[PDB]
Amino acid sequence: ENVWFSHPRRYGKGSRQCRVCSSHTGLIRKYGLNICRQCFREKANDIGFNKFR
Amino acid sequence: KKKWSKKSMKDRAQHAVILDQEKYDRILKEVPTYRYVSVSVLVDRLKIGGSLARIALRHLEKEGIIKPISKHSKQAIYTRAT
Amino acid sequence: SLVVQEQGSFQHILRLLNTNVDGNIKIVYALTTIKGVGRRYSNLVCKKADVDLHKRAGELTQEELERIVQIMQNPTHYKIPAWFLNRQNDITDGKDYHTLANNVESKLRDDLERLKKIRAHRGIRHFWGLRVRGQHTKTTGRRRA
Amino acid sequence: IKIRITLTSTKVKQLENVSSNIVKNAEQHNLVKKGPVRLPTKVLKISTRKTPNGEGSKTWETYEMRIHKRYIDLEAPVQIVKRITQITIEPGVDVEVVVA
Amino acid sequence: AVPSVQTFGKKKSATAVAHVKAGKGLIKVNGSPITLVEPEILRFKVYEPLLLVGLDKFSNIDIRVRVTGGGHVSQVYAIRQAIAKGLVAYHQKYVDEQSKNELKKAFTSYDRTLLIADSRRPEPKKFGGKGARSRFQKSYR
Amino acid sequence: LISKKRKLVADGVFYAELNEFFTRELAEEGYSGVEVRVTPTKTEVIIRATRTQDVLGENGRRINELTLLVQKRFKYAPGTIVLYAERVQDRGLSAVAQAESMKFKLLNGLAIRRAAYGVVRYVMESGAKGCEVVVSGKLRAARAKAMKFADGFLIHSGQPVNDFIDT
Amino acid sequence: PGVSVRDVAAQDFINAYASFLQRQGKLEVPGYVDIVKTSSGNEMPPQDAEGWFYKRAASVARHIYMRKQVGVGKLNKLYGGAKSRGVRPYKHIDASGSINRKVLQALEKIGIVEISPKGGRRISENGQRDLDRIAAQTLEEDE
Amino acid sequence: VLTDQNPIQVVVDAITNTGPREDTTRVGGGGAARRQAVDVSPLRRVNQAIALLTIGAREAAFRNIKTIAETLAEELINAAKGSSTSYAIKKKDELERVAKSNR
Amino acid sequence: GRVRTKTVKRASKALIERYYPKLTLDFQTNKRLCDEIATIQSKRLRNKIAGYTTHLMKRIQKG
RNA sequence: UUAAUUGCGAUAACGAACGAGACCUUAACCUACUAAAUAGUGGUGCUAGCAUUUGCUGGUUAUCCACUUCUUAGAGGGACUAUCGGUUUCAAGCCGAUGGAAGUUUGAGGCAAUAACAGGUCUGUGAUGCCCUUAGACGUUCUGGGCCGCACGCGCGCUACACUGACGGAGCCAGCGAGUCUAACCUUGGCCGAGAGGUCUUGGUAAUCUUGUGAAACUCCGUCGUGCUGGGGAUAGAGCAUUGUAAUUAUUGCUCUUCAACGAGGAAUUCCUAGUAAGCGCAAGUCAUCAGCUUGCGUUGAUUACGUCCCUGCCCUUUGUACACAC
């Protein structure tokens, strides 16, 4: 019961997970969007982030 | 095992740094006839210590024999008044 | 500008606790030749002894050094705040100390041997000669044995 | 009341028209107010690798989001301010009012 | 009612704004006299105008300069451009255009940057290298 | 609560979330895109769909449950989310609608060549300057290949692609 | 002729004011100086043992005069430098705050510097009034 | 302080005295045959004349008592007067000498 | 480089072939009428056409 | 003629499409419906110096008064080979002369075709067939270990081998940028405290708070003077702190001892044509404090630019081929 998830994940690398695919790598924590670098590339257009230079 | 060195020789420099009467009166009688006097000029001609060169230079300008023209650090340019 | 008469009393070498200490150089940087006292420690011991910092190792009287050595031997006696010393709270005693020219190696051997005798990770590493402060041994340290 | 309506949109054309018709609609009421204050643009830069894996030349694409914030100072009664702001609402633009 | 003119000079990222009026022949930078920066290399740089056309145009004109941005040498460049424009703009509005077009001709001949702000803005850095054009290193085996 | 910088970047995710959410259930409904209208204590979410009667359902059955999904997804106060659906003209001018149409035709069992020829022919009549379709993968071979369909004149480079081209 | 502060040199002022403070002997330094690093990035203490604090007080006094409000952390940044982390590349490092803090309360203690609103220090009336005797040597000699 | 004539003239006389009048360029030939002597433009002269004076000074003040200011002077003193011992002058005629042999 | 493309060369040629008495040798007075005579979507493009129109005008002036 | 299948033009081709260009982003003169005292303010109120004659800085908070030329960027704007000088079937166009925030398309970047690669990624994906798979498993986790292990070789890197330099003062000057709900992140000042962080938070829908970025580099004056020296925490030992239900294989920062290799580094090799290179450092990504990496940047600011194809590779054409995934 208490040991099922006893080891903390409130800090470090296990706390953050991609809000689209739950991955823990290549995350964009800046501005609090928390999408992986792979998925942000597809979602950059509709999130408002556009290429200019 | 190889250490990739050259290890050239040395000249065994003997810059004296505490000066006695023999050096003190030698520089006093030789500060004339020197068109350009500096820290490196003193040590490369009268073989005195590096700090002695700048301290002696301050002594020669305190009483005043060699008239400085440029008082910059890292390069002291003193001439002798005539 | 200040000039002095140089006599034969100049000592080209100094004898401090069976170690050759150079003359004709700054007293602060001459004392660094002693194992255990360096640029800062010589600065402090010379401040406590009230010796003119501009003077060399040539014109120093025997009394001027006898206080310098006394400070080196017993720093805690002169009310030192116990953060300059190289050996604070020794494992063997717990009291503030400061290592000497020959004591620094003796205690370094003593503090290395206690790790060896207890077979700690650090002690087996010093016995091995490998890096003990976590440095990777994969890349650095090939031409050392 | 010393109201300060604020505008924090990203599309400049949407900001510029809605601010233009906020001044002319407030001036048509013959009320006092200040002209728009153009704050510096706030570009938000997300610099990321282009590749999904870790193979290839190190190529990076830098996405930018432009944020344009504008405030206009007005002193108008609320019983007309409420009917001033909510009308000509524009999609994408963010027109909001504050109290004190 | 006091005859004044506010002008600007620019550098790589430095900018000096000059307030030029009909005063007492004083020149000041950043609340301090321009004559006491004294690094003995750039003293002549801010002195170049008054050194080449004299003080005949500096008798009854007070100039105060506020420079910001950039570095030491950049700020000095901006300072020279600010005081240069101020004298140009001062004789543009109040003194004869003959005085202004002759001082511009001497200032241009001595140094174009006495009138033109240097158009050499920095180049942004690109990826794959340490700088704008330099690369990291090409390894082959 | 949140700085206007980070609030706006969170708006795009709220749209990016809504755009992805509305592409899965409403697939058979010909969903094209969504637009979000933000109002003080109100949010208008407009759906451009091919089949309004399907997205509406009986007595609004198919328009109210999705309104509840978005409401309970982001935990707003009840009654502050309003869901509207409209018939979107120019079905051929929306690449999303055409791409799903080919997807559903492929899942039905229709040959890839005829389905791709149908869509470019349909986009032809819709008033498009040009259209392009690529079907990449296993096509009559265990080895993948990406064979293409197009007509008219397209554009590949420059800013006009960002506006005059829908992908 | 007219008297003003900034119309004199900056390099000779700092030294001359420090000698003024040293000669007067009223700064009221507790005495624990010549012990601390004076900056965590500075690995050696000042060479000017008998001074280094009359100048620092002279340095801050001119600094607070030209500024309006300054803080302990701000002056640590102003007097800080780069720490040589050996092989690691250089980084800016702030100075110890005690030296800067106790050099300002010393200025408070003797009357040079008064506390200011919105936090910080300020050039005081007594601090400015003693600059006339400071600039007297400069003006008398050159004119 | 030395050479009581105009100080600037010495520098320009130094530069005008160490500009190599002719040097030799690399020619491939049939794998390796020779080097060919070619004339030097006045702009190339000044480029080399400035360089040799500045190279000599940096290499002379390195690891010695002499400051970069005083040793850069002593290279210009000998370059302007002509001593065949200054770093710039020795290299100038050495390059000229080798160009003469490899005409 | 300095060479210009067909999109400004044929546009300039077409204008001269049709609007000859309305334009003249000067670039500045040709810019004002080129942007109102022909719908040009770019400031840079309209500048190029007006420059190639006055260029051919100088050539037409002599033979 | 091309930093252009760019155009001028012979023309069995004509008319087109894609690519290039055009397009989009920055610096910066509109001084009039682009500014709040969120920036010098033009006159408030007085205090600290001298001249009773004419300055050098601080400022309560909705009286303002003919308010906007600097980091702020819309509407006719602006730079198109101006014009001119010469060279070319005067044809598109090399090159020079004053000019203007700038002239080989202004600088730089984004976007960027048609084939292809068994290129890389099944370890981003809740995007996907097979695996003695559905109550001892590769699934799901919990504790302890570990690319955090050393005979060795290689790649990207950091700091040095010092007087143009180390250290001690002192003077201080940028630009990108970030920072707050089931919040103690952004160390502002009044925590005595004193590297670090517990006290309090008086603090802006982040120009008035960190930060008028108030920083490293740099730069008057002094300390050693050419030595394996003050170029030395590279490597050990001893201690002091904060993030972390937890660091022993230094988390990281701080104070103290000794010189260790290293003395313009072999063959070889990389990058580079302007405010570039190079020196320097800062913000962001990562981040539980603190990263020798990256991305951006900004400070100080070098030798030729009339280049060549022999210097390894591209583009086009002609030619030979016994080659054909093709030397």
Q: Which helix (H) or strand (E) holds G80?
A: none
Answer yes or no: are the C-beta atoms of B15 and B50 closer than 8 Å: yes
Task: Specify the experimental method.
Answer: cryo-EM
Work out the angle at residue E38's Cα, subtended by the Cα atoms of residues E33 and E39, and round it to the nearest 5 degrees. 140
- I44: DSSP letter: H
Q: Is A48 flagged in the annotation as binding?
A: no
**How buried is residue G83: exposed, middle or buried, by Cβ count under 10 Å (0-12/13-18/19+)?**
middle
> Both tokens of residue B12?
């065994």
Q: Is A36 flagged in the annotation as binding?
A: yes
Residue B75 neighbours by CB under 8 Å, 6+ apart: B38, H67, H69, H70
CA nearest to D48 within chain E: E127
Question: Within the 1-53 window of chain A, which residues sit less than 8 Å (CB to CB) from chain D?
Answer: 28, 30-31, 37-38, 40-41, 44, 48-53
- E117: DSSP letter: P
Please give the Cα distance from E39 to H95 (Å, whole number): 41
- Closest CA-bearing residue to C1' of J1: I3
Give CB contacts under 8 A, 24+ apart, made by C103-108: C103/C36, C104/C35, C104/C36, C105/C35
- C102: DSSP letter: T
Q: Is A13 flagged in the annotation as binding?
A: no
Domain tally for chain A?
1
Touching, D vs E (3+ Cβ pairs under 8 A): yes
Crossing angle of helices A37-47 and F4-21, rounded to 10°: 100
Answer yes or no: are the C-beta atoms of E36 and G8 closer than 8 Å: yes
Q: Which residues lie across from E27 on neighbouring strands? A: E63
What is the DSSP annotation of C103-116? Answer: HHHHHHHHHHHHHH
> Both tokens of residue I21?
């008495």
Please give the Cα distance from E72 to E63 (Å, whole number): 20
- Taking the CB of residue F50, how many other CB atoms lie within 10 A of it? 19
Answer yes or no: are the C-beta atoms of G82 and G91 closer than 8 Å: yes
**How buried is residue G49: exposed, middle or buried, by Cβ count under 10 Å (0-12/13-18/19+)?**
middle
CB G88 within 7 Å, strand J: yes
Tell which residue, D65, D62, D96, D59, has the closest CA to residue D81.
Answer: D96
Tell which residue, E68, E59, E63, E55, has the closest CA to residue E85.
Answer: E63
Please give the Cα distance from F103 to D81 (Å, whole number): 51
> Both tokens of residue F21?
């959410």
Please give the Cα distance from C69 to C56 (Å, whole number): 17
Element counts in chain C: helices (H) and strands (E)? 5, 2
Please give the Cα distance from F29 to F97 (Å, whole number): 10
CATH fold of I6-61 reads: Diphtheria Toxin Repressor; domain 2 (1.10.60)
> Could you tell me how many residues make up chain D?
100
Residue F157 neighbours by CB under 8 Å, 6+ apart: none
CA H44 to the chain's CA centroid: 12
From start to end of chain E, where are the E strands?
Answer: 4-10, 15-21, 27-29, 32-33, 62-68
**F56 CB-side CA count, 13 A:** 10
> Both tokens of residue F121?
């022919």
Please give the Cα distance from G4 to G134 (Å, whole number): 11
Work out the angle at residue B20's Cα, subtended by the Cα atoms of residues B14 and B26, and round it to the nearest 5 degrees. 85
Q: Is A18 flagged in the annotation as binding?
A: yes
Phi, psi values for residue B31, rounded to 5°: -60, -25
Residue I22 neighbours by CB under 8 Å, 6+ apart: I33, I37
Please give the Cα distance from F126 to E38 (Å, whole number): 77
Interface membership of A1 toward F (CB under 8 Å): no
The identity of residue D20, as a single letter, is S
Domain spans, chain I: 6-61
Please give the Cα distance from H3 to G139 (Å, whole number): 39
Answer yes or no: are the C-beta atoms of F80 and F43 closer than 8 Å: yes
Please give the Cα distance from F124 to F129 (Å, whole number): 8
Work out the angle at residue H17's Cα, subtended by the Cα atoms of residues H16 and H19, and round it to the nearest 5 degrees. 70
Please give the Cα distance from A43 to H21 (Å, whole number): 67
> Both tokens of residue G84?
């040589």
Can you give the distance from the CA of residue E129 to the C1' of nucleotide J277 in angstroms? 13
Can you give the distance from the CA of residue E71 to the C1' of nucleotide J300 in angstroms? 8
Q: Name every chain F residue with its beta carbon within 8 A of the beta carbon of D44.
A: 5, 9
Q: Is F76 helix (H, G, I), strand (E, B) or coil?
A: coil
From start to end of chain F, where are the E strands?
Answer: 31-39, 42-49, 81-87, 130-138, 144-152
Please give the Cα distance from I27 to F159 (Å, whole number): 29
Tell which residue, G38, G18, G11, G2, has the closest CA to residue G134.
Answer: G18
Can you give the distance from the CA of residue E120 to the C1' of nucleotide J275 in angstroms? 5
Answer yes or no: are the C-beta atoms of G5 and E32 closer than 8 Å: no
**How buried is residue D70: exposed, middle or buried, by Cβ count under 10 Å (0-12/13-18/19+)?**
buried
Interface membership of A32 toward F (CB under 8 Å): yes
Nucleotides of J under 7 A from a protein CB: 1-4, 6-8, 17-25, 27-29, 33-36, 38, 40, 42, 47-51, 54-59, 62, 66, 69-74, 76-84, 90-95, 99, 101-105, 107-116, 118-127, 141-143, 147-160, 162-181, 187-191, 193-196, 202, 205-207, 211-230, 232-240, 244-246, 248-259, 261-265, 269-278, 280-282, 284-288, 291-301, 303-305, 310-311
| Exposure string over E96-132, b if 16+ CB within 10 A, otherwise e | eeebbeebbeebeeebebbeebeeeeeeeeeeeeeee
Q: Name every chain H residue with its beta carbon within 8 A of the beta carbon of B40.
A: 65-67, 70
The identity of residue B44, as a single letter, is D
> Could you tell me how many residues make up chain I?
63
The identity of residue D95, as a single letter, is V
CA distance between the termini of chain C: 54
Please give the Cα distance from A28 to F9 (Å, whole number): 12
- I20: DSSP letter: G
Please give the Cα distance from E35 to E28 (Å, whole number): 8
The CATH number of F6-83 is 3.30.300.20
**How buried is residue D6: exposed, middle or buried, by Cβ count under 10 Å (0-12/13-18/19+)?**
middle
Q: Is A9 helix (H, G, I), strand (E, B) or coil?
A: coil
Q: Which residues lie across from F14 on neighbouring strands? A: none
Please give the Cα distance from F30 to E56 (Å, whole number): 83
CA distances from E104 to C68, E52, G37 (A): 71, 12, 55
Q: Is E18 helix (H, G, I), strand (E, B) or coil?
A: strand
Can you give the distance from the CA of residue C144 to the C1' of nucleotide J232 in angstroms? 20
Q: Is C20 helix (H, G, I), strand (E, B) or coil?
A: strand
Please give the Cα distance from C92 to B15 (Å, whole number): 48
What is the DSSP annotation of B18-73? Answer: S--HHHHHHHHHHSTT-SSB-HHHHHTTS-B-HHHHHHHHHHIIIIISEEEEE--T
Q: Is A33 helix (H, G, I), strand (E, B) or coil?
A: coil
D77: left (phi over 0), alpha (psi -120 to 50) or beta: beta
Q: Name every chain F residue with its beta carbon within 8 A of the beta carbon of D86.
A: 40
- F27: DSSP letter: G
Q: Which helix (H) or strand (E) holds F54?
A: helix F52-56
CA distances from G72 to C68, G79, G98 (A): 36, 11, 9
Q: Which residues lie across from E5 on neighbouring strands? A: E20
Strand pairing report for E62-68 and D42-49: unpaired
